[PDB]
Design a protein around this ligand. Structure first.
Ligand SMILES: [K+]
Ligand SMILES: [K+]
Ligand SMILES: [K+]
Ligand SMILES: [K+]
Ligand SMILES: [K+]
Ligand SMILES: [K+]
Ligand SMILES: [Mg+2]
Ligand SMILES: [Mg+2]
Ligand SMILES: [Mg+2]
Ligand SMILES: [Mg+2]
Ligand SMILES: [Mg+2]
Ligand SMILES: [Mg+2]
Ligand SMILES: [Mg+2]
Ligand SMILES: [Mg+2]
Ligand SMILES: [Mg+2]
Ligand SMILES: [Mg+2]
Ligand SMILES: [Mg+2]
Ligand SMILES: [Mg+2]
Ligand SMILES: [Mg+2]
Ligand SMILES: [Mg+2]
Ligand SMILES: [Mg+2]
Ligand SMILES: [Mg+2]
Ligand SMILES: [Mg+2]
Ligand SMILES: [Mg+2]
Ligand SMILES: [Mg+2]
Ligand SMILES: [Mg+2]
Ligand SMILES: [Mg+2]
Ligand SMILES: [Mg+2]
Lengths: 313, 101, 49, 199, 88, 565, 167, 132
RNA sequence: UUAAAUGGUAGUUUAUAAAAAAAUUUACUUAAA
RNA sequence: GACCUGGCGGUGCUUCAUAUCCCUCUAGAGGAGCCUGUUCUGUAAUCGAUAAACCCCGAUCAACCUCACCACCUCUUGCUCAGCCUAUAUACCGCCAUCUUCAGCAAACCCUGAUGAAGGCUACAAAGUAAGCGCAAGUACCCACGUAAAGACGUUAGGUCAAGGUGUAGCCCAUGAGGUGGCAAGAAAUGGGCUACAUUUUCUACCCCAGAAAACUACGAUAGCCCUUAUGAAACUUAAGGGUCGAAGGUGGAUUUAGC
């Protein structure tokens, strides 16, 4: 699959004409039709439900479709263009040479935000296939270059090979404090445990009354352990007897329903505690949705994991 | 031209059962009650027993319409598991895919 | 109705408007068996009596 | 072979202007024709270092039920021609409460559109009649007798009497039967029998 | 066409069934198939007989292959004449 | 929605390989498709058993097998009626005779129905799926025998017999039967009178005046019998009057004026007959001019409905009159009428549609600005008709007149796509126009590319199998076009073809070859120019050689040049 | 039954039995005959002639109608087709005379022709290849056991002094 | 090892189309369905008769167009209509194609009592997705 | 650094490849003797 | 005689098995009754699977039908341009098991062994480059987790001529087709499962703050007998319930299964 440059040029010629045709079909301005409008139109005109998105109908700029192919490396005379052509990795060894040169000069004169460029993405930059050990060798020099007091130019060179890790914050999101007709401050949250789904309304000020589906919590949860779960969020922050809760729970069994409410109450109560307390609650496991759900039974077995009795003979 | 003699015997049973269905329904109604005299119900017992054996609906067998396999048939498609899987695995049955969950 | 399907497509083959690859295969095999000397015996005039 | 093998003409998408009347090309639902659609649309899971397959001879695109005959331009043009057939909703019946006051009875019927040689569907015969007993001229005795006669057809929370009828082959017969049942129920509820004194 | 329309997506139904893997014996091994039925509900309101007749014909004729439709029609009717007052 | 101009008619398969690429392929592709439908219908009716399972709801009667054989085997009058309904001419007669021999009574209505079947079909079986010149009526036919057998003969029996005779060109026999009809004091119907009018004109070869008197006498007979004339009565008169070249024009107008007074509305057929009568091959066309203008004024914005079988023949004739008069505005009025409402359906069969559009487009190219002609070219071709090779010549001539020769390469491509790749007249015309005058470099390059393509069409001629033909003009033009574009290498090869094919090169080709050699300064090439012309004994060569000898010529070559002559 | 019939490819794949357990560890090589080679669309046993498929659509500028070959004409067509088959079959039966090497069944001394031309415009038409030895060497693999390979010595030479050999 | 509808790897000389290259686990994931009707939707009837008709049509078209079909059929059903989309080759003369389209559309309409259309797409040669 | 015997006979490896076809053959109605 | 490659070794060294080899953890099987397969024996009376990789297996299923079995009777160009559940899974397609709870397979070239079978890595690098297939990636399900799905080439001439199709051979007054009636049992052994042997239990109320029962009238049969009903043309037989009966069993040897 060797796509010559003239062919790619013709493909671009057909995308621009096709792009104007699609704008005409959809009644849009040919001149402000973007790639995100193209994708919306193609999805409507050619509806495909195939689970894998790479198999669906696509109309993209040929530069984004066809793979990046390296240019001819020698002229008609036959003399290759790069002095490191016969190495076979002219782009990799050209870079390796440059970094070694910079390091020699630097000596003579004398992170969360960003990750080291991964291997598959360095190969794209060089348009050369590399081994894992080649990638390690390159990174070992770049790191050495940072350890030394690299100058303003050397820092720019390194940053070519540093991507930006956007670090996800593990901070709980607080729900807005609303006010009812009577002006009582309350927060509402949601929880899910197995198949139980509970909505909890925690009032800022109260006496400690919990109503579950309109019933007093001790009557709804006769089992003590279930009542212990409802106590844990409030006991952990020393706020027993200071809030009223009106929660509704549906689905699941007795324990799942008590677990769903615990998560809902904890998420809601984050509005009325300090940020530091919210972090402690998160570190005690009071704000995490439990992902442990019933595993499916498999054909040819007794249960999810159990097998049928095995007979050697 | 039916797949085999067994399929051909089932075709004849389905035809004879259709012809006698009304007569059999009427006579059974006389038998399946406690209202009518037992003497009349005894005569109906004999009359339904004298009808041809191949009119009895219990003798019909749901065979695969393509291969005549008498077992492993899916009633919705009337196909044996083997024939159904052949058509399903080639993508020729609308909306039927491999189930993974 | 396997009688209609079979009889219809048989007629369509004799009219030259349907190519039955299956029937062609078993037709060649019957022709070659006849040359090899294996042919259906005449009814009544069987190998037994 | 004095004339050489017949050569396929170039695709007619090369003659199409960029400001054509596309609804004229795809007036009705038709299969995707790569020679008629002037889009370089590709489809197919790409092989390693490969691209999604082109549109010519692409069976994946043929499978898609395309909407090239229903472009937004066509829909707006189509509906402009179909406005003559529509009649205006009575402006008086602004809200659902106003509809109930003037038209107490609601008849629900269902039509099933499936693909095949036969249109028949045995579910289409079912008719559901709903009427609130507050819209009927019922005294105290009649209302109590009616609620007892119908049984679970009456819902106390909503005060709606639901009469579902599916005895007769046709929907029109089931509609006439449902309306008939409401009539005999109304008149029987008003009638007072002597045995009613044993309540 | 001036019709009030509201769309909601009813939950999907996935029907699954199991078949034997091999033609003969080998019971432990199965093949599991499914048919996914997805839904979309278009709730029209305050239509007249003529408007509904035209809208339904237009969208029904353009129903894509493999899509079924169930049209539930609620008709507003007046009290039967016989029910206006009791005869007894 | 409107007609899609880029597509061929919808009846064809929308695929580049299957789309028709010529006027003939259009006809043949439809004929092949119709044959397929006939073969399927033949099988369906030959083996109904296979197509008797009805799974359609609602039931579709049209998709069921048809049974054409009589299912009543009893010999009776009621069973005979079936055979007449089935149009079994031979079976009905044989059964009718058997019925008569048995002595059972056959109703007059049943006998009249049998005569209708025999009289209409001339006692011949209607064509079936599978089992012109001259008078088709035969003296020994069943209709005549049965007609005499009839014990009671009503007016309808005579009528259908007269109509049959006229239909089958038994004009004299029909007129004799009408005389017998009058002797019996039986009134004839409108349809018999319409047939009798045709018989009068066809039967004898008397001059117009006598035929007109006879026609007027039948009209007076029609009025005497209280018979009201229909539209067909007048349309036949006009069709009959076409035979009288210049003597029926004014009478024909009187007939038209009579129609309007009575209240019979002239249909398209009526006007078709008039314009055909008034349009005889004469240069002035003065009367024809007035007729067509007045007819078009009357028909403006009139939606028509089928009234006469000849309604489909109007538009082709009207466009023919406009081409003869060379009036584009009238043609646009005629075409306007075709496009109003549903009048487009009256264009007629394929050969009518091609003729109409050929005459219409040929008049546009001649009489309209090039910019509008090209719009009509885009809209009509290929969506409406596949052009004739001569219409491309007319389009090329229009382009020449407009000085828009940048489109000639496009016309060639379209010509190849419409099946004119190997039309000699078209290929020669394009080359001549391209090479007639010198053009700017870009236009000269484009013409060279088209010339190379035309040259390839000549190299790959299907006639090449029969023989090699390379017209002298074509060869000369191609060579000159190569020289002007700067492809001297390609032009140098053409010199071998001239002598090979024995085609004499024009002086302009030889005179211009000088510069090509002079710019190169290769005396060898200069002599080759002299050597060729000397073979043909062209007088310019001798005078030319001396000039070349002065400019660039090797000493040794100069001596040889003179001796070669 | 019609619905039980299969395509020719599946039939020939089963009948040939090229894939199996009997064709692996050295455990009649009948060949597939293409039966569609001589078949023309529209030709049937009855002999019906169809305008536009079996016979030309228009004869003398007139669209032909459905016709049928006479009893005796169809017999000729069938007999001719049978003869045309015996000819095609005959060609395959014919054995081409192979120039033998040192022995009838020995690969030594059999010319292989000129070496294939190189990609960079290189032609080796002067050189003549001739085999010298063909040996069936074997190794043992864990999965399959006896694994058969071919060792082939050849010699190439132009006849003017240049000459090499390779395995 | 699984067998169902898996074209087995060869020496790298065997051309396969996109449909033939994908095993059954890829249906609804990378390749779609070759027949679209409502029979197999929840609450829909007559799946059995739709299945038989599809099996027949695929065989009818294989024998009626011998050597022409270059890929599997795409059967589409909309209400009463049946649409057969076939990718054929460019070897048979156009006349013979038009005859067979008119013949097949008529014969099938009378057999299944419904309007049937056949949409032929011609390709120069079999579209090769990969060489197995 | 306890002890831990046995597994019927024969059978598990070389001469080549592949069909071909053929076209249809350009623009009305109409009429006459 | 000396080698190449593979296998194998009660073969060495080092590093390890994640429900996994040992010691450990939880619940079982092996013992009792019953349900359901198999082997044997039995019957005039199917067939196939039958170390791991058979044994509630082809069957998401046999009272007739199904059926291919047995006895008897009947038919002959036969529901089919016949038929055959007749032989051959050691001729095959098709669909699969198994290693796989694997990571290798291989076209095309180059180099090494003096041009033998064969071999081809060392990163501060020393002859390998490798399209393709698999793994992986991606997708399905509730996540990027897990679980499914997937899993090449080959190994067991592994399973299946009885899903169907089919090569070869056989039958054609029968080895084909139809009708009626009938067998599918238990000396003995064993696999899987079910219910129990009870007090963390039994019954009732309740679905979790209760009262009684608790050793020959307790715990414990889903068996036996009897009766009714359901399905069906047909029920000594199949299923449900009622009555009656109250049995072995008192926690199970060697051995053995599953689970992160
Ligand atoms: K031996
Ligand atoms: K070793
Ligand atoms: K135990
Ligand atoms: K066999
Ligand atoms: K067999
Ligand atoms: K057990
Ligand atoms: Mg049964
Ligand atoms: Mg598996
Ligand atoms: Mg020899
Ligand atoms: Mg021994
Ligand atoms: Mg041994
Ligand atoms: Mg036990
Ligand atoms: Mg057994
Ligand atoms: Mg066995
Ligand atoms: Mg029996
Ligand atoms: Mg039995
Ligand atoms: Mg038998
Ligand atoms: Mg085997
Ligand atoms: Mg994952
Ligand atoms: Mg798995
Ligand atoms: Mg994977
Ligand atoms: Mg074996
Ligand atoms: Mg076996
Ligand atoms: Mg027998
Ligand atoms: Mg108990
Ligand atoms: Mg009991
Ligand atoms: Mg009973
Ligand atoms: Mg007790």
């Amino acid at each position: 699959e060797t796509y010559t440059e003239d062919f790619i040029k013709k493909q671009i010629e057909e995308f621009n004409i096709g792009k104007r045709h699609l704008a005409n079909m959809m009644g849009e301005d040919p001149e402000t039709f973007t790639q995100e409008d193209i994708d919306r139109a193609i999805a409507y005109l050619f509806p495909s439900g195939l689970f894998e998105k790479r198999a669906r109908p696509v109309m993209k700029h040929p530069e984004q479709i066809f793979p990046r192919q390296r240019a001819i490396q020698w002229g008609e005379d036959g003399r290759p263009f790069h002095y490191l052509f016969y190495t076979g990795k002219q782009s990799y060894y050209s870079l390796m040479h440059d970094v070694y040169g910079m390091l020699l000069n630097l000596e003579k004169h004398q992170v969360i935000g960003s990750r080291w460029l991964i291997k598959e993405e360095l190969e794209e930059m060089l348009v050369e296939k590399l081994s894992d050990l080649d990638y390690m060798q390159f990174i070992r020099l770049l790191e050495k270059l940072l350890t030394s007091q690299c100058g303003a130019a050397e820092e720019e060179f390194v940053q070519r090979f540093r991507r930006s890790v956007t670090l996800e914050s593990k901070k709980q999101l607080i729900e807005p404090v609303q006010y009812d007709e009577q002006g009582m401050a309350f927060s509402k949250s949601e929880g899910k445990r197995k198949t139980a789904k509970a909505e909890a309304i925690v009032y800022k000020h109260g006496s400690g009354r919990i109503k579950v589906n309109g019933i007093d919590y001790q009557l709804y949860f006769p089992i003590t352990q279930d009542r212990e779960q409802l106590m844990f969020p409030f006991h952990f922050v020393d706020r027993l007897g200071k809030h009223d809760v009106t929660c509704t729970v549906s689905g699941g069994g007795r324990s799942a329903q008590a677990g769903a409410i615990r998560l809902a109450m904890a998420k809601a109560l984050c509005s009325f505690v300090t940020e530091d307390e919210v972090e402690w609650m998160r570190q005690a496991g009071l704000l995490t949705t439990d992902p442990r759900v019933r595993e499916r039974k498999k054909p040819g077995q007794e249960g999810a994991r159990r097998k049928f009795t095995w007979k050697k003979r | 031209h039916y797949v085999d003699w067994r399929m051909w015997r089932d075709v004849k049973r389905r035809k004879m059962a259709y012809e006698y269905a009304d007569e059999r329904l009427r006579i059974n109604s006389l038998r399946k009650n406690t209202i009518l005299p037992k003497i009349l119900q005894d005569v109906a017992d004999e009359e339904i027993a004298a009808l041809p054996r191949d009119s009895c609906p219990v003798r019909i067998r749901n065979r695969c319409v393509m291969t005549s396999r008498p077992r492993g048939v899916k009633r919705r498609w009337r196909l044996s598991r083997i024939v159904f899987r052949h058509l399903a695995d080639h993508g020729q049955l609308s909306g039927i895919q491999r189930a993974t969950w | 109705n396997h009688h209609t399907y079979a009889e219809l497509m048989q007629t369509l083959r004799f009219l030259g408007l349907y190519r039955d690859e299956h029937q062609d295969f078993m037709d060649e095999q019957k022709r070659l068996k006849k040359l090899r000397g294996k042919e259906k015996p005449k009814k009544g005039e069987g190998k037994r009596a | 072979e004095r004339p050489p093998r017949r050569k396929a003409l170039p695709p007619r998408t090369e003659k199409m202007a960029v400001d054509q009347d596309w609804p004229s090309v795809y007036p009705v639902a038709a299969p995707f024709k790569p020679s008629a659609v002037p889009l370089p649309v590709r489809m197919g899971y790409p092989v390693k270092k490969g691209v999604p397959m082109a549109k010519e001879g692409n069976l994946e695109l043929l499978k898609i039920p395309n909407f090239l005959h229903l472009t937004p331009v066509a829909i707006k043009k189509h509906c402009e021609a179909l406005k003559d057939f529509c009649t205006e909703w009575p402006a008086a019946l602004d809200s659902d409460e106003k509809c109930e006051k003037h038209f107490p009875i609601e008849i629900d019927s269902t039509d099933y559109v499936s693909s095949g040689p036969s249109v028949r569907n045995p579910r289409a015969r079912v008719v559901v009649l709903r009427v609130k007993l507050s819209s009927l001229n019922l005294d105290d005795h009649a209302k109590k007798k009616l609620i007892k006669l119908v049984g679970e057809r009456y819902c106390k929370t909503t005060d709606v009497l639901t009469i579902k009828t599916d005895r007769c082959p046709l929907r029109r017969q089931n509609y006439d039967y449902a309306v008939y049942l409401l009539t005999v129920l109304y008149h029987e509820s008003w009638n007072t029998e002597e045995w009613e004194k044993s309540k | 066409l001036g019709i009030s329309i509201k769309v909601h997506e009813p939950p999907r139904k996935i029907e699954r069934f199991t078949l034997l893997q091999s033609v003969h014996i080998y019971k432990k091994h199965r093949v599991q198939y499914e048919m996914r039925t997805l839904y979309r509900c278009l709730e029209l309101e305050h239509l007249t007989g003529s408007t509904a007749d035209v809208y339904l014909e237009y969208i029904q004729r353009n129903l894509p292959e493999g899509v079924a439709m169930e049209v539930t029609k609620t008709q507003l009717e007046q009290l039967p004449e016989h029910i206006k007052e009791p005869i007894w | 929605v409107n007609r899609d101009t880029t597509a061929v008619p919808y009846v064809f398969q929308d695929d580049p390989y299957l789309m028709p690429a010529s006027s003939l392929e259009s006809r043949s592709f439809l004929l092949a498709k119709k044959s397929g439908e006939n073969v399927a219908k033949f099988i369906i009716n030959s083996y109904p058993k296979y197509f008797q399972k009805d799974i359609a709801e609602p039931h579709i009667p049209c998709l069921m097998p048809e049974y054409f054989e009589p299912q009543i085997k009893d010999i009776s009058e009621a069973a005979l009626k079936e055979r007449i309904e089935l149009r079994k001419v031979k079976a009905s007669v044989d059964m009718f005779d058997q019925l008569l021999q048995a002595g059972t009574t056959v109703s007059l209505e049943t006998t009249n129905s049998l005569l209708d079947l025999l009289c209409y079909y001339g006692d011949q079986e209607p064509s079936t799926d599978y089992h012109q010149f001259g008078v088709t009526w035969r003296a020994k036919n069943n209709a005549e025998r049965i007609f005499s057998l009839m014990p009671e003969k009503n007016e309808h029996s005579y009528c259908t017999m007269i109509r049959g005779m006229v239909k089958h060109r038994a004009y004299e026999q029909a007129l004799n039967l009408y005389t017998e009809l009058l002797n019996n004091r039986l009134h004839a119907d409108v349809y018999t009178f319409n047939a009798l009018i045709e018989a009068t004109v066809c039967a004898i070869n008397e001059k117009f005046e006598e035929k007109w008197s006879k026609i007027l006498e039948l009209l007076r007979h029609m009025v005497a019998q209280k018979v009201k004339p229909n539209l067909q009565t007048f349309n036949t008169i006009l069709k009959c009057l076409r035979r009288f070249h210049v003597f029926a024009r004014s009478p024909a107008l009187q007939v038209l004026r009579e129609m309007k007074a009575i209240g019979i509305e002239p249909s398209l057929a009526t006007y078709h007959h008039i314009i055909r009568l008034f349009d005889q091959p004469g240069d002035p066309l003065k009367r024809s001019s007035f007729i067509i203008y007045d007819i078009m004024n009357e028909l403006m914005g009139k939606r028509f409905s089928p009234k006469d079988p000849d309604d489909d023949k109007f538009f082709q004739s009207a466009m023919s009159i406009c081409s003869s008069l060379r009036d584009l505005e009238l043609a646009y009025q005629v075409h306007g009428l075709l496009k109003t409402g549903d009048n487009w359906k009256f264009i007629g069969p394929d050969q009518h549609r091609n003729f109409y559009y050929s005459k219409f487009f040929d008049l546009i190219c001649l009489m309209e600005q090039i910019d509008v002609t090209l719009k009509w070219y885009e809209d009509l071709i290929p969506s409406a008709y596949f052009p004739h090779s001569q219409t491309m010549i007319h389009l090329l001539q229009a382009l020449d007149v407009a000085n828009r020769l940048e489109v000639i390469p496009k016309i060639w491509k379209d010509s190849k796509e419409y099946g004119h790749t190997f039309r000699s007249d078209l290929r020669e015309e394009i080359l001549m126009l391209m090479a007639r005058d010198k053009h700017p470099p870009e236009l000269q390059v484009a013409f060279a590319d088209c010339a190379a393509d035309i040259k390839s069409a000549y190299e790959s001629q299907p006639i090449r199998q029969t023989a090699q033909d390379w017209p002298a003009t074509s060869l000369n033009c191609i060579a000159i076009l190569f020289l002007r574009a700067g492809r001297t290498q390609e032009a140098w090869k053409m010199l071998g073809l001239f002598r090979k094919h024995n085609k004499i090169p024009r002086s302009e080709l030889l005179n211009e070859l000088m510069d090509s050699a002079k710019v190169s300064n290769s005396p060898s090439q200069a002599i080759e120019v002299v050597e060729l012309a000397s073979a043909f004994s062209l007088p310019i060569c001798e005078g030319l050689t001396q000039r070349v000898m002065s400019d660039f010529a090797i000493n040794q070559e100069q001596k040889e040049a003179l001796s070669n002559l | 039954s019609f619905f039980t019939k299969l395509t020719a490819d599946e039939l020939w794949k089963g009948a040939l039995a090229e894939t199996g357990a009997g064709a692996k560890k050295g455990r009649k090589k009948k060949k597939r005959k293409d039966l569609n080679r001589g078949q023309i669309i529209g030709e049937g046993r009855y002999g019906f002639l169809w305008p536009g498929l079996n016979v030309p659509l228009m004869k003398n500028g007139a669209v032909q109608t459905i016709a049928q070959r006479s009893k005796e004409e169809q017999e000729k067509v069938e007999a001719d087709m049978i003869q045309q088959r015996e000819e095609w079959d005959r060609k395959k039966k014919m054995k081409v005379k192979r120039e033998r090497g040192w022995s009838g069944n020995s690969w030594g001394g059999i010319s292989l022709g000129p070496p294939d031309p190189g990609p960079c415009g290189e032609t080796y038409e002067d050189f003549d290849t001739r085999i010298l030895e063909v040996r069936n060497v074997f190794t043992m693999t864990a999965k399959e056991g006896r694994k058969k390979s071919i060792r082939v010595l050849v010699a190439v030479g132009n006849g003017k002094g240049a000459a090499g050999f390779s395995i | 090892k699984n067998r169902a509808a898996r074209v087995r790897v060869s020496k790298g000389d065997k051309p396969v189309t996109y449909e033939e290259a994908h095993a059954p686990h890829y249906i609804a994931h990378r390749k779609g369905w070759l027949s679209l009707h409502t029979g197999n939707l929840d609450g829909e009837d007559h799946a059995a008769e739709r299945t038989v008709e599809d099996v027949f049509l695929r065989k009818f078209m294989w024998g009626t167009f011998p050597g022409c079909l270059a890929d599997q059929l795409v059967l589409k059903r909309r209400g009463n209509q049946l649409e057969i989309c076939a990718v054929v080759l460019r070897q048979l003369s156009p006349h013979k194609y038009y005859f067979l389209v008119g013949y097949s559309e008529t014969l099938l309409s009378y057999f299944y009592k419904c309007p049937v259309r056949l949409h032929l797409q011609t390709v120069p040669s079999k579209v090769v997705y990969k060489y197995l």
